[PDB]
Amino acid sequence: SGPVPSRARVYTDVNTHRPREYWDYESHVVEWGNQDDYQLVRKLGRGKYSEVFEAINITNNEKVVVKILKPVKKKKIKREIKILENLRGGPNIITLADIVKDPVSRTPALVFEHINNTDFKQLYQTLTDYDIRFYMYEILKALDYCHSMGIMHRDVKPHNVMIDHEHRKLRLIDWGLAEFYHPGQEYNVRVASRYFKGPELLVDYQMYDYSLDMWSLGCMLASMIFRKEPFFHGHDNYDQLVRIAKVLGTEDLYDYIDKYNIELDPRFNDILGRHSRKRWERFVHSENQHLVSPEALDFLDKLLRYDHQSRLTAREAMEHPYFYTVVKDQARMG
Ligand SMILES: O=C1C=C2C[C@@]3(O)COc4c(ccc(O)c4O)C3=C2C=C1O
């Protein structure tokens, strides 16, 4: 008949129950700020869809970051803008400060709050067990918030998580692949970085939901506590699922495929083969054991599940004993 349909377990109808103007980004009309407020200072990065610069707001001398977009259809730009505006003020969500027309490229440029982020090299060789729990908890706040607002990020990965370590400050950035969740909708599976793609994308199951972000987050946790980035390192999208199967096993993978009546290319089955489920303890060695605990492995195991419907939600994840010390610490009298 086709694959078995699927709905999100939580926040299923959040957009169903909001005004059309909340999620109908195509009709959103941008009001433009003034580009002459901002002077570019140095290029930070070059992407396929944008250039990113450190800049100065010359009217108050504050640093900002400017993302100058490549020419793209109005609809994709409006989607990102709408989502950033809907989510503005949410916990650990990057703040969109302004939208201007770049005077040279004549393309939209998005202006963000500046985060003095610690570079990866120093960070992931200095992070303690407590640091990892704390920052994971902060990422979960952002994901619960955006999921509760009817939005999937769909590009959760280390480089889209900015951390200012001395201020213990974290922002989830890069909302350019984000989309509104509508139950029953078939989404594009060409989202997320290869290494953080969930099984549902790798087998071309389009009716996915917020739980995609929880797989990606589980991949991030594994890479941090086992000190191997990325944890699942495939050479293409097919090989990515093979790397996952060599750890999670093929039994539970085929059970997943059976439950949703998903059809795989016969050659996919070949490369997938037959693999036993490994114990998480197999990846613990002397150089990472200080980051690993029974609580971390239990938590990890409940994120990295083939069946998207069986993964923890962000709110459930925050209730895990892994975070008891973090929660206690954040319970302040102020
Ligand atoms: O869509 C994006 C993309 C970026 C690219 C980029 O990662 C560059 O570097 C940044 C930054 C944001 C704050 C910041 O302090 C910083 O250094 C960025 C973004 C924010 C977004 O919403």
51 is in an annotated binding site: yes
Please report how the helices 129-148 and 211-225 are oriented relative to each other, as an axis angle in degrees rounded to 10.
Answer: 170
Secondary structure letter of residue 26 according to DSSP? G
C-alpha span between 94 and 172 (Å, rounded): 6
Distance from the alpha carbon of residue 282 to the mean position of ligand 1, in angstroms? 36
Whether 155 sits among the annotated catalytic residues: the reply is yes
Strand partners, 62: 57
Distance of CA 48 to the CA centre of its chain: 18
Q: Can you tell me the distance from the alpha carbon of 79 to that of 150, in angstroms, rounded to the nearest whole number?
A: 13
Atom 8 of ligand 1: nearest residue by CA position: 52
294 Cα: distance to centroid of ligand 1 (angstroms) = 35
Residue minimizing CA distance to atom 21 of ligand 1 = 174
Residue 78 and residue 25 in contact, taking contact as beta carbons nearer than 8 Å:
yes
* Residue 150 marked ligand-binding: no
| CA atoms 132, 134, 139, 143: torsion sign | positive
Alpha-carbon distance of 312 to 10, in angstroms, equals 10
- Listed in sequence order, the residues at least 6 apart from 240 whose beta carbon sits closer than 8 Å to its beta carbon are 194, 195, 197, 202, 232, 234
Distances in Å between the alpha carbon of 248 and those of 251, 288, 306, 313, 330? 9, 20, 8, 20, 34
Tell me which of 24, 37, 102, 155 is the catalytic residue.
155
Q: Check the annotation: does 306 bind a ligand.
A: no
In angstroms, the CA 46 to CA 52 distance is 6
- For residue 15, the 8-state DSSP code is T
Q: How far is the CA of 312 from the centre of ligand 1 (A)?
A: 28
46 is an annotated ligand-binding site residue: yes
Q: What is the largest CA-CA distance in the chain?
A: 62
How were these coordinates obtained? Answer: X-ray
Q: Which segments within the chain are labelled E, that is strand? A: 38-46, 50-57, 62-69, 96-101, 108-113, 151-152, 161-164, 169-172, 179-180
- Rounded Cα distance between 191 and 155, Å, is 7
- What is the number of H-type helices and E-type strands within the chain? 12, 9
Centroid of ligand 1 to alpha carbon of 159 (angstroms): 9
Ligand 1, pocket residues at CB < 6 Å: 44-45, 52, 65, 67, 94, 112, 114-115, 117, 162, 173-176
Nearest CA to ligand 1 atom 11: 65
CA distances from residue 289 to 27, 106, 136, 226, 227 in whole angstroms, order as listed = 52, 52, 18, 8, 10
The Cα 230–Cα 242 span in angstroms is: 15
69, 77 contact by CB (below 8 A): yes
Q: Which two tokens stand for residue 95?
A: 């703040």
Scanning the structure block, which residue is given the tokens 């969930």? 198
* Coil vs helix vs strand at 97: strand
Resolution stated for this PDB structure, in Å: 2.0
HSE-CB at 240 with a 13 A cutoff on CA atoms is 17
For the chain, give every domain's residue range.
6-23+115-333, 24-114
Backbone angles phi, psi at 221, to 5 degrees: -60, -45
What the block records as the tokens of 195 is: 């290494």
53 in helix, strand or coil? strand
For 97, 158, 172, the CA distances from 44, given in Å and listed in that order, are 18, 16, 17
